[PDB]
Each structure stands twice: as C-alpha cells, then as structure tokens.
Amino acid sequence: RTVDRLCLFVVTPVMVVGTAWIFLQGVYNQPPPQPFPGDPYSYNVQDKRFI
Amino acid sequence: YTENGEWAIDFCPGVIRRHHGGATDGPGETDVIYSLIIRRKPLFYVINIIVPCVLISGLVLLAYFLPAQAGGQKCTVSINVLLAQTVFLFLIAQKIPETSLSVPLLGRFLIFVMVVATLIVMNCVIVLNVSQRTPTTHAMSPRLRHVLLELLPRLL
Amino acid sequence: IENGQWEIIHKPSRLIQPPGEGQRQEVIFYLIIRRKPLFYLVNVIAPCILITLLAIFVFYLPPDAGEKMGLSIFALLTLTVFLLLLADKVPETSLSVPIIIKYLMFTMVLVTFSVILSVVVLNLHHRSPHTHQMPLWVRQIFIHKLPLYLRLKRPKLPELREVVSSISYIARQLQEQEDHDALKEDWQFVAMVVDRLFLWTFIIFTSVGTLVIFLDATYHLPPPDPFPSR
Amino acid sequence: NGEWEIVHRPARVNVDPRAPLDSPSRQDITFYLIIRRKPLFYIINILVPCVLISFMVNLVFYLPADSGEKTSVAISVLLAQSVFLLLISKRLPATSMAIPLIGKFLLFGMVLVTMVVVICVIVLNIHFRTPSTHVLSEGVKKLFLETLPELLHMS
Amino acid sequence: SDWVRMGNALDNICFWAALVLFSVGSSLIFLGAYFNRVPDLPYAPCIQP
Amino acid sequence: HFPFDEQNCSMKLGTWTYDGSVVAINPESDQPDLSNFMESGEWVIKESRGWKHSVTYSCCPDTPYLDITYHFVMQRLPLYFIVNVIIPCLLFSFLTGLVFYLPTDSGEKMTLSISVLLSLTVFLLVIVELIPSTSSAVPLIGKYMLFTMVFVIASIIITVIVINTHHRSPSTHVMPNWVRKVFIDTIPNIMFFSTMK
Amino acid sequence: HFPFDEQNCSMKLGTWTYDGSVVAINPESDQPDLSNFMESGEWVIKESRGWKHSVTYSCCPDTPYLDITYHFVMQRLPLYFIVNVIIPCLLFSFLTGLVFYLPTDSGEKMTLSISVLLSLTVFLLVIVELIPSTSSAVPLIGKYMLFTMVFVIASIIITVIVINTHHRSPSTHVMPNWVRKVFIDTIPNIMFFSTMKHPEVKSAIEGIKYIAETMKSDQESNNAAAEWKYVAMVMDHILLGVFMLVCIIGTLAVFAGRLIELNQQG
Ligand SMILES: *[C@@H]1O[C@H](CO)[C@@H](O[C@@H]2O[C@H](CO)[C@@H](O[C@@H]3O[C@H](CO[C@H]4O[C@H](CO)[C@@H](O)[C@H](O[C@H]5O[C@H](CO)[C@@H](O)[C@H](O)[C@@H]5O)[C@@H]4O)[C@@H](O)[C@H](O[C@H]4O[C@H](CO)[C@@H](O)[C@H](O)[C@@H]4O)[C@@H]3O)[C@H](O)[C@H]2NC(C)=O)[C@H](O)[C@H]1NC(C)=O
Ligand SMILES: *[C@@H]1O[C@H](CO)[C@@H](O[C@@H]2O[C@H](CO)[C@@H](O[C@@H]3O[C@H](CO[C@H]4O[C@H](CO)[C@@H](O)[C@H](O)[C@@H]4O)[C@@H](O)[C@H](O[C@H]4O[C@H](CO)[C@@H](O)[C@H](O)[C@@H]4O)[C@@H]3O)[C@H](O)[C@H]2NC(C)=O)[C@H](O)[C@H]1NC(C)=O
Ligand SMILES: *[C@@H]1O[C@H](CO)[C@@H](O[C@@H]2O[C@H](CO)[C@@H](O[C@@H]3O[C@H](CO[C@H]4O[C@H](CO)[C@@H](O)[C@H](O)[C@@H]4O)[C@@H](O)[C@H](O[C@H]4O[C@H](CO)[C@@H](O)[C@H](O)[C@@H]4O)[C@@H]3O)[C@H](O)[C@H]2NC(C)=O)[C@H](O)[C@H]1NC(C)=O
Ligand SMILES: *[C@@H]1O[C@H](CO)[C@@H](O[C@@H]2O[C@H](CO)[C@@H](O[C@@H]3O[C@H](CO[C@H]4O[C@H](CO)[C@@H](O)[C@H](O)[C@@H]4O)[C@@H](O)[C@H](O[C@H]4O[C@H](CO)[C@@H](O)[C@H](O)[C@@H]4O)[C@@H]3O)[C@H](O)[C@H]2NC(C)=O)[C@H](O)[C@H]1NC(C)=O
Ligand SMILES: CCCCCCCC/C=C/CCCCCCCC(=O)O[C@@H](COC(=O)CCCCCCCCCCCCCCC)COP(=O)([O-])OCC[N+](C)(C)C
Ligand SMILES: CC(C)CCC[C@@H](C)[C@H]1CC[C@H]2[C@@H]3CC=C4C[C@@H](O)CC[C@]4(C)[C@H]3CC[C@]12C
Ligand SMILES: CC(C)CCC[C@@H](C)[C@H]1CC[C@H]2[C@@H]3CC=C4C[C@@H](O)CC[C@]4(C)[C@H]3CC[C@]12C
Ligand SMILES: CC(C)CCC[C@@H](C)[C@H]1CC[C@H]2[C@@H]3CC=C4C[C@@H](O)CC[C@]4(C)[C@H]3CC[C@]12C
Ligand SMILES: CC(C)CCC[C@@H](C)[C@H]1CC[C@H]2[C@@H]3CC=C4C[C@@H](O)CC[C@]4(C)[C@H]3CC[C@]12C
Ligand SMILES: CC(C)CCC[C@@H](C)[C@H]1CC[C@H]2[C@@H]3CC=C4C[C@@H](O)CC[C@]4(C)[C@H]3CC[C@]12C
Ligand SMILES: CC(C)CCC[C@@H](C)[C@H]1CC[C@H]2[C@@H]3CC=C4C[C@@H](O)CC[C@]4(C)[C@H]3CC[C@]12C
C-alpha cells in the first residue's frame, strides 16, 4: 500500500504535466501575424498600397 | 457465360412500354425495360460473419452454468461476448447498405443478440447480487426464499 | 518539392543499347530512394517493445494474484490490433517477408510462449498435493540445485475420556493440515523457481532476438554506388 | 470550409533573377492560402476520450491489491490506446519530418501505461509475499510502515 | 448457503427463459429470409439449363 | 441535429458570360420538375422551389446580372443511424450503471466497467467512420457518444473509490465519525432498509 | 484451394464486325510472347498458350466466326497469406487447448478462453481485410478460420462444463455411481496419477465435542468436494490430449491434401 501511494503521488503529476506540456504546445500554436516573415505587409483589402 | 461470384441471374424479362400518348401529353414516348431478377449467394456472409456471430452470441447462455462466486467469471463471459459483438458490428458496418427505408436482416440480428447479451449481463449481475448476500449486510427475506426454494420446484 | 517519406540517395541516367531491325535504345533514369521510417518506429516498433516488456514482466507476477493470464492474453490482443494496423500498410507480394512482419510474428510467438509457460507455472502452483506426489528428481532439480544458481534462497470417567478423544482428533486434523501445507508449499516453491527460470530465459531470448532483428534492420544501408559490381 | 478557416490569403508576383529571361521558370504569380484547422471534431471524438482513458490508468494505484483487477485495468488502458493509434494511423501521412502532437501524446501515454503495468506487477509481487517465500527485514518495515507513511500523510 | 441455493434456482429458471428468447428470436429473424425466395414468376429462366 | 437534420441545398444557375442586358433567363415553373424523380433511400424532399434574382453593382448600373436558384429542403431518414449508432450507445449507457449492483466480493466490477469502456472504444471506429468529420458544430450523435464515454469513465472512477472503501480494515484505516453518521444511520432510514447494519 | 490455388484466365480476341469469310486471323505463335514479361510478386505463370477457333452457326452457314483465345495457367505464391493469416490462426488454435492444462482454482480459465476468442475475433478483421470476399466457394483459408473458431467455441463450452463439475457442491449434488466408475475407478488405471458438574463445565465439554464434530463434518464435505475436483482434473487431462490431437488433425486435414497434390506436381 505504501509503494502504491508513493507511485500515485509520483506518476500522476508526471502524466498531468507531460500531457499539459504536449497539448499547450498545440493550443498556443497560431499562424504568424503576417503571411511572410520579415515582410510587415498584411496583404489585406484594408491595407491598400496605392500607386 | 461465367456466373458472378455473388449474384445469380434468376430472371430477365423485357417489356416495351409506351406512354404520354394522350392529347394533353402530346407526342408519345416509348422505351424498353429489362428486369434482372438476381439472387445473392450468401455463402461468404454465412461462413465469415453469421456463423461466428451466432456461436459467439450463443456463448452467453453458458454464463448461467458458471458458479456465482469470485472465480466464476460469469460477467467476464457475458460482457466479453458483448465486446466481440461490437467488433462484429464494426465488421458489418463495412458491408451493409447505407439506406434507411428498412433495417437489414444482418443488422436486425446483430442488434437483437446485443440486446439479449445486455439482458443476460443484467441477469448475471442480479444473480451475483443475490448469491453473495451475507448475514452481516443483508437480512433474510422469507418471501423470496419461499418463492424460489419451496414454491418454484413444486410448480416446476 | 521534397517528399516526406523518401530521401533521394542517387539519381543517375544511363543509355541502354540494344542486345548485340526493330532494335531500340533506351534512356533509363534511376531513382535510388531510402524510406524514412519514423512513423513505423513511433506507431509499431515502440508499442511492440513495450508489449514485449510486459510479456517478460508477467513472470514476476505472483501466481496467487490470479492475473498472469489476463496480462499475457491482453498483450496478445493488443498485438493483434497492431497486426490490423499493419495490414493497411505492408506490401502484399510473396517473394519475401518484411522484417517488420518478422518482428511482429516474433513478438506474437514470444507472447504465446509466455501464455503457455504461465499456464505451466499456474499448473505447478495450484497442483493438488494429495492427487500428486512430487517425484524425487523434481525435488532434487527444482528445490536443491536450481535455486542456488538462480539466487533464490528458501527461508528455513467417560466424559473426560471423550474430551481427550476430541482434543486428540483436533490435534490430528491440524497435524494433517500441516503436512498438506508442507506439500503445497513444496509445489509452490517449485512453481516459483520455474517462474524465475522462465523469467531469465525470456529476458535472454527476447534480448537476443530483438538485437538480431534490430541490427539486421540498422545495418541495411543504401548502396554507396548506383551500379555496384555483382 | 467545414474544417479549415482562412487566416491569410496573399498574392505575389515572383520573379527569379537567376533564371534566364527565356525560361518558363522566370516568372509566376502565386496565391497562398494560410489555413487553420478547426479542431472541434478531433477534440470531441479523439482527444477527450483518449486523454481521459489515459488518465484513468492512475486509478490502479488507488485500487487495492485484493481486488485482483489491477493489471487488467492497466493493460486494458494500453489496449484502448492501441485502438486510438489504429484510428490515427488512417488519417495522416507517414512522413518523418515530425511526430504529430497526438502521436507524441499517445507515445507518452503508452510508455507511462507500460510503466504503470510494471509497477502494478511489482506491487502485487510485494503484496503476496509470505514468510515461507520472503524475509521481511527490519529496515524495510521501518522505511515502508512508519517513515514513508508519515511523510506521505497516510492514514 | 441458503442465499447460494436461491441464486442457483434463479439461474436455472432464467437459463431456460434466455434460451427460449435467443432461439425464438433468431429463428424468426432467419425464417423471415427463408420465405424471401425469388417469386415463382410467369417467365422462363434467364439461362436455359 | 444530425441524424435528424434538415438540409436546404441550392443550385444557382446563370449565364456565365452574358449579363441581363443581352441574355435574359426566366424560370419555366415556380418549382423544379420532380415527376421523374427516383426514390431516395436516405432523404425526403419536403419542399422545392426556384427563384429568379437580379443584381446590379454600383460600378455597372446598366448590366444587371441574373440567376435562377433552385433550392430543395431535404429531411434525412434517420433509421440507419438509429440502428447502427444510437442503439449500441444506449446499450452501453445502460450497461454502465449495472456495475453498481455488482457486489465487490465478486471481483468483477472492473471487468464489467472496463469491458464496457473497451466496447465503446472499439465502437469509436464505427462512429467516426459514420459521423461527419466537420468542425462547424457537434452533432447530436457526437454529443451522445461523448456523454456515454464521459459517464463510463466517471463510473470507473467512482467504482475504484467504492472498491477502495469496501476493502478498508482497522489494520489500515480508522472509520471517521461523519462517514458512520452519513452512511450507517441517516441514509439507510430513507432507503429500503432491508440490510443489516 | 486459396492461397494454394491455380487459376486459368483466358483472353478471347476477335474481329468484332468482320467474319472469317472476309477477314482471317491467325496466331503468330503457339504461345504468347513472354520475353519482356516483368516478374510478378504474387503469381507464377506455369503455362501459356494461344488457340484459334472457328465456329459456324446454323443460320449463317457461309460466314464462319474466328477467334484466338490466349490462356495463362498461373500458380499463386502463398507466402504472404501463410505468414499474415495462417500463422496467427495456428497460434490461436494452439492456445485453445492450453486452457485444459490450466487448473480451475486459478480462476483464470474463462479469462484465457474468452480472450483467445477476442483475439481471434479481432483477427477476423485482418482476415476480411486481406483475403478476397467471394461466395463462389469456401476458401481453404475460410475452412481453416471456421475450424479455428469452432475449436475455440467448443473449448469454451467444455471449459464451462469442467468448471461446473469442479464446483459442484456435495450437499446439493450427489455423485452418481457411473461418474465414480468411469472417472475415479476406470480411467486413472490407463493414466499415471494417484486416485483419491457445574452447568458451565458441562457446556464447555459439549462445546469441545461440538467443535470436534464440526471439523469432522467439514472433513467429509471437503472430501466429497475433492471427488468432484478430481473428476474435473481427469476430464481436463483427457480434453487436453484430445484438443491437441484435434488441432493437429484438423490442420492436416485442411492443408495436407492440397500440399501433397502440389508436391506431386513438382
Ligand atoms: C508560406 O510559404 C511561402 C512559400 O511557399 C513562404 O514564402 C516565403 O517567405 C520567405 C520569407 O518571407 C521568403 O524568403 C525571403 O526571400 C526574399 C527574396 O529573395 C528571393 O528573391 C530575390 C529576388 O527578389 C532572389 O535574389 C533570391 O534568391 C537568392 O536567395 C535565395 C535564398 O533565399 C538563394 O537560394 C539564391 O541562390 C539567391 O542567393 C530569392 O529568390 C529574401 O530577401 C529574404 O531574405 C531575408 O530573410 C532571410 C531569412 O532566412 C535572411 O537570411 C535574409 O538576410 C533576409 O533578411 C528571404 O529569403 C521566400 O522567398 C518566400 N517564398 C516564396 C514567395 O515563394 C511564406 O513565408 C510561408 N508563410 C508562412 C510560413 O506563414
Ligand atoms: C538498380 O537497377 C538497375 C537495373 O534497372 C541496376 O543496373 C544494373 O547494374 C548491374 C551491375 O552494376 C549491371 O550489370 C553490369 O553491366 C555491365 C555492362 O553490360 C552491358 O554491356 C555489355 C557489353 O559491354 C553487354 O554484354 C551487357 O549485356 C550489357 O548490355 C557489365 O560490364 C558488368 O559486368 C561486370 O559485372 C559482372 C557481374 O556479374 C561480372 O560478371 C563481369 O565480369 C563484370 O565484372 C555487369 O554485367 C547492369 O547492366 C545494370 N542494368 C542496367 C544499367 O540496365 C542497378 O545496379 C540497380 N542499383 C542498385 C541496386 O543500387
Ligand atoms: C432554402 O434556402 C433558399 C436559399 O437558397 C431560400 O430561398 C429564398 O426563398 C424566399 C421565399 O421563401 C425568397 O424570397 C422571395 O424572393 C422573391 C424574388 O426576389 C427577387 O426578385 C424581386 C423582384 O424583382 C427582387 O425585389 C429581389 O431583390 C430578388 O431579386 C420575391 O419576389 C419574394 O417577395 C415576396 O415575399 C416578400 C417577403 O418579404 C414580400 O415582401 C413580397 O411582396 C412577396 O410577397 C420573396 O422575397 C428568397 O429570394 C429566396 N432566396 C434565394 C433563392 O436565394 C429558401 O427560403 C430556404 N427554405 C427554407 C425552408 O428556409
Ligand atoms: C485452360 O483453359 C483453356 C481455355 O478453356 C484451355 O484451352 C483449351 O486447350 C485445349 C488443349 O489442351 C484445346 O484443345 C485443342 O483445340 C485445338 C483447336 O481446336 C480448334 O480447331 C480444331 C481444328 O480446326 C477444331 O476441330 C476445334 O473445334 C476448334 O475449333 C485442337 O486442334 C486440338 O486437337 C488436339 O487434341 C485433340 C484431343 O482430343 C486430338 O484429337 C487432336 O488430334 C489434336 O491432337 C485440341 O482439341 C482447347 O481448344 C482449348 N480451349 C479453348 C482455348 O477455349 C486449357 O486447356 C486449360 N488448361 C488447363 C486446364 O490446364
Ligand atoms: C519499472 C521500474 C521502476 C519502478 C520500480 C518499482 C520498485 C518499487 C520499490 C520496491 C521496494 C521493495 C521493498 C521490499 C523488498 C526489498 C528487498 C528487495 O529489493 O528485494 C526484493 C525485490 O524488491 C523489489 O521490489 C525490487 C524492485 C523490483 C524488481 C524487479 C526489477 C526492477 C524493476 C522492474 C524492471 C525495471 C526495468 C524495466 C521496466 C522499466 C525481492 O527480490 P526477489 O524477488 O528475491 O528477486 C528479484 C529478482 N529480479 C529483480 C530479477 C526480478
Ligand atoms: C491537463 C490535461 C487535462 C490536458 C489538457 C489540458 C487542456 C484542457 C488545457 C491546458 C491549458 C488550457 C488553456 C489555457 C488558457 C486558455 C486561454 C483561455 O482563453 C481559455 C482557453 C485556453 C486556450 C485553455 C484551453 C484548455 C487548455 C489547453
Ligand atoms: C431491441 C430488439 C427487441 C429488436 C432489435 C431489432 C430492431 C432493430 C428491429 C425490431 C423491430 C424493427 C422495425 C419493425 C418494422 C419496421 C417498419 C418498416 O416499414 C421499416 C423498418 C421498421 C421500423 C423496423 C426497423 C428495425 C426494428 C426496430
Ligand atoms: C520469428 C519466428 C519465431 C516466427 C515467425 C517466422 C517468420 C520470421 C518466418 C516464417 C516464414 C519465413 C520465410 C520463408 C521463406 C523465405 C524466402 C527466402 O527469401 C528466405 C527467407 C524467407 C522470406 C523467410 C523469412 C522468415 C519467415 C517470414
Ligand atoms: C480533462 C479535460 C480537460 C478533457 C481533455 C481536454 C484535452 C483533450 C485538451 C487538449 C487541447 C485542448 C484544447 C486547446 C485549446 C482550446 C481553447 C479554446 O479554443 C477552447 C478549448 C480548447 C479547444 C481546448 C479543449 C480541451 C483540449 C482538447
Ligand atoms: C427479433 C425479434 C426479437 C423481433 C422480431 C419482430 C418481427 C415481427 C419484425 C423484425 C423485423 C421486421 C421487418 C423489418 C422490415 C420490414 C420491411 C417493411 O417494408 C415491411 C415490414 C418488415 C418486413 C418488418 C416486419 C416485422 C419484422 C419481421
Ligand atoms: C467527469 C469527468 C470524468 C470528466 C468528464 C469529461 C469532461 C472533462 C469533458 C466532457 C465534455 C468535454 C467538453 C466538450 C466540448 C468542448 C468544446 C471544445 O472547446 C473542446 C473542449 C470542450 C470544452 C470539452 C472539454 C472536456 C469536457 C468537459
């Protein structure tokens, strides 16, 4: 019973933390604000580049 | 002619139909309709699906003969027959037609045996609940005892 | 557009002359391409290794737990699920067997033998001491010789007359139960020794076979030259 | 689209200065689609079931050894994870550039469930020891019956 | 022991109930197909034997 | 509302290169012609209707753009999904609660609950191959599946707690006073009370 | 005989609209030209040959219709189906008989048998995915799969019978004389196993007597139960032998006929 309780308190946090790290890698994965890195232009109809 | 591996052509009459010959309809129309009455040869479904499913679904009746003790594994047999029937449902979903005008015989049989397995699982749970009653938790019902031990054998 | 599953090792082109009109030359463009197996390592090989480890560890499970059979047979069931996974991917020709199929069937055979030997261990453990008598060679091998090699150390007035009779009967029954327990403990110790022997045998066989297959896979390199001498 | 949302959608004239002016590869116009997956379907039908089934394996540590159903629970969780892996295998290509996030979680969960099965085997081995099989030393008793329970605040 | 005997009697009668249910339902479902032969139509066979 | 969903699917038709000032299209009838319509084994067309539309942009005042849109309201026939999806889920949901009538001493509570879970997991293959793989919304089938899965998991958790409680002894635990008060005295008075204390 | 099946597919060629009286076709050679044939990973062409045919119908006695039918006799290469289908079925069939060596007191007999059935049921998905699905006849793989399934089902049924016999209470059930004659007396001869005055003082005296009689009654009950357990034991050994023999004989009866035929043809 003592070994089981220790293994609970050791293994369950590891599972929770690993799952959290793996899934917060993806939840906060978004495309960049601009289509092309290094190019500030947004290529949107609101930001027209008049000649 | 080489017969199709699954379909035998039993009949094939042809009829020339004429229609829209009325004045309101205007010019008449015609066509030729052939009616292939074709019979399925169900040997594949019999050997690979129906017979194994029937035997596996018959296995739940064996649960009534296992002891109502810890090592009887009555519920093991019943619920694992249910799991095998779920596997057979996955197998059958790949083959059955996907229309909703009626329920196919294979689907009806599989749902029926699944319902029977569920009822027998409930029965095994009830029998185990009755069998493992001990004086330290449950009181002796005399009515049920008279019904099952005394009245039933004489009635039976 | 680089392929996600294939790396181009070589890419030569050759002019093939006719043998020795209707004769026709050819221009053959060769692509020697190596598969990048990360998907199969993640989805097949590592689960198989884990299942193999559990199949080993079933021999450390005590017989009295009543759980050896479930563990081994559900390991086999999981391996069947992985066979279903591989059925969609593996080639369907019959000139040779893929090495991953060889590894899968090797693991299936190990799990099957773990099931069989667990049944043997449970038969020894639950053996009736009254119906069965331990043969002397079984005693000598599995209680005296083998435990030393496996590092298994086994520890170690009518009323008064009728009352005397009852007490003597009770003591005799308890003595008989003690003898029965001694025989039952001998059988259980033999089962334990056999279980440890099978544990070490499975460790050795698993390690050797897995290493052989893995080294056969790892050392299969692409050809350094597109047209090697034969 | 029922699964893809357009984030960016630029258009560019690309001219390759290196190519000769008489090459078809000199000039082109490229229309790009940056598209974000809407993961509600995969969330509901895969991730919540898979994650919860993986997390239930930790319940074996709270199961008593006398229940006789510990390794069965753990190996069944492993089997369910294998079924989920079979599910994933039909949906993505077998590319080697990276392990998918769901694939990463499934590998992590399978490894942890295997460790939990091994731990359950060891715990059951400890639980069923008797004087006729093992010697219970005083050090093990001191460590596991007094010292670790008081640190763990056990009853 | 009285509880075990009660459980045994329940098991005995419910076995027969379940057997009748399974057999009758399966037989009815499959005899539904048994009477689904191709009708005896007033046409010659498509393939003359 | 899938599989009890009603759909409204349209067919927009127009002259691609001719505008209303050169070619004019008019509907032949208010409704599409369904006289030669084959029966569908999956859908019922409740309503059908064709409408003409004319659109004039501010940059082209003089060239109206015409179209005829034929729409069909279609109700799915749900029997196939009732038989092949809903009923097995209902059976699993029913089997979920039966573990709580099983005695702990049977040593089969986890067997039953985990086997129900495994059946649900295997049935997941059927459901995802049948359910639409779109993320616009959660179908009713998906909601019921998630309900069933979540509550078999909850039953497994609570069953582990119940089995842990059953196996307690004075050699490991001491009975709290509140547990005794709640479960031995108050609740059995509002129960069948056919069980000794 | 699948996957040890030989096939004979033809390719009938003819002038669709021209009869033999206006257009005559002749084969270039007796055999198809296989000089540029790519090796197949699934089939070996044992034989190939082209034959010309001329047919005159009753209502057209002056326009013979000509055709050239090429034909190829092909033998399937069965290694893929042997490895992927037959070997797992062999392993399941071998594991089917091991339940009869598993004692009843382990409490794991139904676990083993039912889980072998579950593994076979899951593998049925593999079989249906791999082999063709046709109803012209039962393939040899189909016969072997059905044999394995019926073998597992029979093992489960007989295991339930053995478990029922093992657990028979001696109070409710009384051992028939015939059961004792066959299983305890006759069969083990062929086998090698062993057959089967203050009030308080008087109250205490009667208590010792009652304890002694209670252990005596328990001993009789235990011996009577042990008779049933011995019967189940003997049945388990016989059934282990019978099931291993049935496994071997069934595998041979399924495969060895076609294997011997192919051996005789080479
Ligand atoms: C989606 O996917 C698209 C592609 O399908 C991505 O678009 C790409 O974005 C990147 C970054 O915004 C672009 O790279 C930049 O390119 C410019 C221009 O260089 C190009 O054009 C020149 C003529 O105008 C030409 O001379 C260049 O050729 C030289 O360079 C290349 C290598 O770039 C080399 O191979 C040649 O031999 C030549 O030497 C080239 O054709 C360039 O100026 C940028 O340089 C900046 O950024 C880099 C970052 O590494 C940095 O090192 C530099 O110092 C400098 O700061 C950069 O290379 C790429 O061209 C785009 N591809 C297209 C349009 O097809 C898009 O970003 C993706 N979106 C995402 C991920 O959201
Ligand atoms: C990928 O697959 C291709 C085939 O599609 C392989 O290409 C073959 O490679 C082999 C070995 O490199 C080649 O065999 C060699 O051919 C040489 C040229 O032969 C031609 O010319 C002579 C006259 O000069 C003709 O008689 C002959 O018919 C050919 O037309 C030979 O000179 C070589 O001989 C040498 O090796 C042999 C080995 O048996 C020795 O016996 C000789 O003494 C001598 O040392 C040899 O025969 C073959 O031609 C290639 N086929 C082609 C190009 O179509 C690739 O190797 C393979 N790549 C891999 C596996 O990485
Ligand atoms: C399924 O989905 C389809 C869309 O594909 C819906 O179709 C719409 O149906 C409604 C009717 O229920 C249509 O509304 C009607 O449009 C007529 C045509 O409008 C064109 O022509 C007029 C005249 O030139 C223009 O003014 C107009 O801009 C269009 O160019 C109108 O004549 C109708 O007017 C009638 O109703 C209004 C109600 O406000 C009254 O004020 C009027 O006096 C008159 O009684 C009406 O507006 C609509 O146009 C359709 N849209 C399409 C096809 O794109 C289905 O309704 C939907 N089904 C269900 C069950 O939801
Ligand atoms: C795989 O399947 C194919 C397709 O069915 C089989 O092909 C048959 O092969 C046999 C030979 O094994 C063929 O039999 C031979 O036919 C020849 C041509 O017949 C035509 O021409 C003659 C002459 O004009 C006509 O009389 C006849 O009606 C046809 O129009 C004959 O010349 C051969 O005669 C030889 O054998 C006979 C044996 O009785 C002798 O009497 C003769 O003297 C001579 O020696 C012979 O009859 C048959 O026609 C093929 N049928 C086809 C292609 O449809 C393969 O045999 C089969 N392979 C297996 C099972 O391994
Ligand atoms: C999974 C690993 C991490 C968790 C471990 C949990 C341990 C928790 C703490 C355990 C505390 C034990 C206290 C009581 C016993 C004290 C005396 C003693 O040590 O001897 C006892 C064992 O004791 C053990 O339980 C040792 C650990 C398990 C041994 C199995 C191999 C190592 C772990 C699994 C493989 C790891 C690698 C692969 C899988 C990752 C008696 O030993 P024996 O029975 O006479 O002989 C053993 C022989 N054997 C070792 C060959 C079997
Ligand atoms: C730890 C176990 C349950 C694994 C799964 C963890 C999931 C449920 C958690 C971990 C961190 C969470 C995110 C943390 C913060 C935010 C920002 C806020 O706008 C709510 C959504 C969002 C984006 C959460 C979504 C759910 C989330 C991704
Ligand atoms: C649950 C148990 C009792 C029965 C299992 C089989 C089920 C699937 C069977 C039993 C009765 C059957 C229904 C009986 C009659 C009809 C009317 C017909 O016009 C369409 C099919 C329909 C609606 C059937 C569908 C399938 C059905 C619901
Ligand atoms: C691993 C063991 C214990 C069980 C599984 C046996 C497997 C590995 C056996 C069964 C049949 C065997 C194949 C039979 C014949 C050939 C053809 C030739 O090219 C030699 C190797 C090859 C391709 C063998 C490779 C190994 C093989 C696939
Ligand atoms: C234990 C509970 C939380 C169930 C497990 C949830 C797991 C699977 C996690 C992993 C990633 C998570 C998602 C990541 C991002 C978001 C933020 C927002 O868009 C709503 C929730 C949503 C969509 C999360 C839902 C929960 C989620 C799917
Ligand atoms: C399975 C057991 C428990 C119940 C059986 C009930 C019977 C009466 C049910 C089950 C399936 C049903 C059939 C299912 C579908 C159809 C097609 C429909 O166009 C006419 C009715 C008909 C032909 C039904 C008639 C009644 C039916 C045969
Ligand atoms: C009772 C215990 C076992 C937990 C039961 C499962 C719980 C955690 C499940 C059941 C329903 C699930 C939610 C269903 C749908 C959504 C919307 C989407 O944004 C993803 C996350 C989110 C919000 C899920 C989070 C996890 C969830 C709340």
JSON list of C-alpha atoms and ligand atoms in Angstrom, two decimals, chain D residues 40 43-44 48 52, chain F residues 146 150 153-154 157, ligand 11:
[
{"chain": "D", "resi": 40, "resn": "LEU", "atom": "CA", "xyz": [-13.56, 20.65, -32.63]},
{"chain": "D", "resi": 43, "resn": "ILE", "atom": "CA", "xyz": [-11.09, 17.29, -29.94]},
{"chain": "D", "resi": 44, "resn": "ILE", "atom": "CA", "xyz": [-14.51, 15.80, -29.18]},
{"chain": "D", "resi": 48, "resn": "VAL", "atom": "CA", "xyz": [-11.05, 13.96, -24.75]},
{"chain": "D", "resi": 52, "resn": "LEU", "atom": "CA", "xyz": [-9.41, 10.59, -20.19]},
{"chain": "F", "resi": 146, "resn": "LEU", "atom": "CA", "xyz": [-19.23, 11.96, -25.51]},
{"chain": "F", "resi": 150, "resn": "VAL", "atom": "CA", "xyz": [-17.57, 10.57, -20.03]},
{"chain": "F", "resi": 153, "resn": "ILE", "atom": "CA", "xyz": [-15.17, 6.97, -17.21]},
{"chain": "F", "resi": 154, "resn": "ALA", "atom": "CA", "xyz": [-16.98, 8.53, -14.23]},
{"chain": "F", "resi": 157, "resn": "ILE", "atom": "CA", "xyz": [-13.55, 6.32, -11.17]},
{"chain": "H", "resi": 11, "resn": "LIG", "atom": "C1", "xyz": [-16.45, 13.65, -15.08]},
{"chain": "H", "resi": 11, "resn": "LIG", "atom": "C2", "xyz": [-15.01, 13.51, -15.55]},
{"chain": "H", "resi": 11, "resn": "LIG", "atom": "C3", "xyz": [-14.68, 12.05, -15.83]},
{"chain": "H", "resi": 11, "resn": "LIG", "atom": "C4", "xyz": [-14.74, 14.38, -16.77]},
{"chain": "H", "resi": 11, "resn": "LIG", "atom": "C5", "xyz": [-15.65, 14.16, -17.95]},
{"chain": "H", "resi": 11, "resn": "LIG", "atom": "C6", "xyz": [-15.07, 14.65, -19.25]},
{"chain": "H", "resi": 11, "resn": "LIG", "atom": "C7", "xyz": [-15.01, 16.17, -19.42]},
{"chain": "H", "resi": 11, "resn": "LIG", "atom": "C8", "xyz": [-13.68, 16.70, -18.92]},
{"chain": "H", "resi": 11, "resn": "LIG", "atom": "C9", "xyz": [-15.31, 16.55, -20.88]},
{"chain": "H", "resi": 11, "resn": "LIG", "atom": "C10", "xyz": [-16.78, 16.21, -21.27]},
{"chain": "H", "resi": 11, "resn": "LIG", "atom": "C11", "xyz": [-17.24, 17.26, -22.29]},
{"chain": "H", "resi": 11, "resn": "LIG", "atom": "C12", "xyz": [-15.94, 17.97, -22.68]},
{"chain": "H", "resi": 11, "resn": "LIG", "atom": "C13", "xyz": [-16.03, 19.28, -23.45]},
{"chain": "H", "resi": 11, "resn": "LIG", "atom": "C14", "xyz": [-16.83, 19.08, -24.73]},
{"chain": "H", "resi": 11, "resn": "LIG", "atom": "C15", "xyz": [-16.56, 20.14, -25.75]},
{"chain": "H", "resi": 11, "resn": "LIG", "atom": "C16", "xyz": [-15.69, 21.12, -25.61]},
{"chain": "H", "resi": 11, "resn": "LIG", "atom": "C17", "xyz": [-15.65, 22.28, -26.59]},
{"chain": "H", "resi": 11, "resn": "LIG", "atom": "C18", "xyz": [-14.29, 22.46, -27.23]},
{"chain": "H", "resi": 11, "resn": "LIG", "atom": "O1", "xyz": [-13.80, 23.77, -26.95]},
{"chain": "H", "resi": 11, "resn": "LIG", "atom": "C19", "xyz": [-13.32, 21.42, -26.72]},
{"chain": "H", "resi": 11, "resn": "LIG", "atom": "C20", "xyz": [-13.27, 21.38, -25.19]},
{"chain": "H", "resi": 11, "resn": "LIG", "atom": "C21", "xyz": [-14.63, 21.15, -24.51]},
{"chain": "H", "resi": 11, "resn": "LIG", "atom": "C22", "xyz": [-14.95, 22.32, -23.57]},
{"chain": "H", "resi": 11, "resn": "LIG", "atom": "C23", "xyz": [-14.61, 19.78, -23.77]},
{"chain": "H", "resi": 11, "resn": "LIG", "atom": "C24", "xyz": [-13.70, 19.77, -22.53]},
{"chain": "H", "resi": 11, "resn": "LIG", "atom": "C25", "xyz": [-13.71, 18.44, -21.77]},
{"chain": "H", "resi": 11, "resn": "LIG", "atom": "C26", "xyz": [-15.13, 18.02, -21.37]},
{"chain": "H", "resi": 11, "resn": "LIG", "atom": "C27", "xyz": [-15.72, 19.00, -20.35]}
]
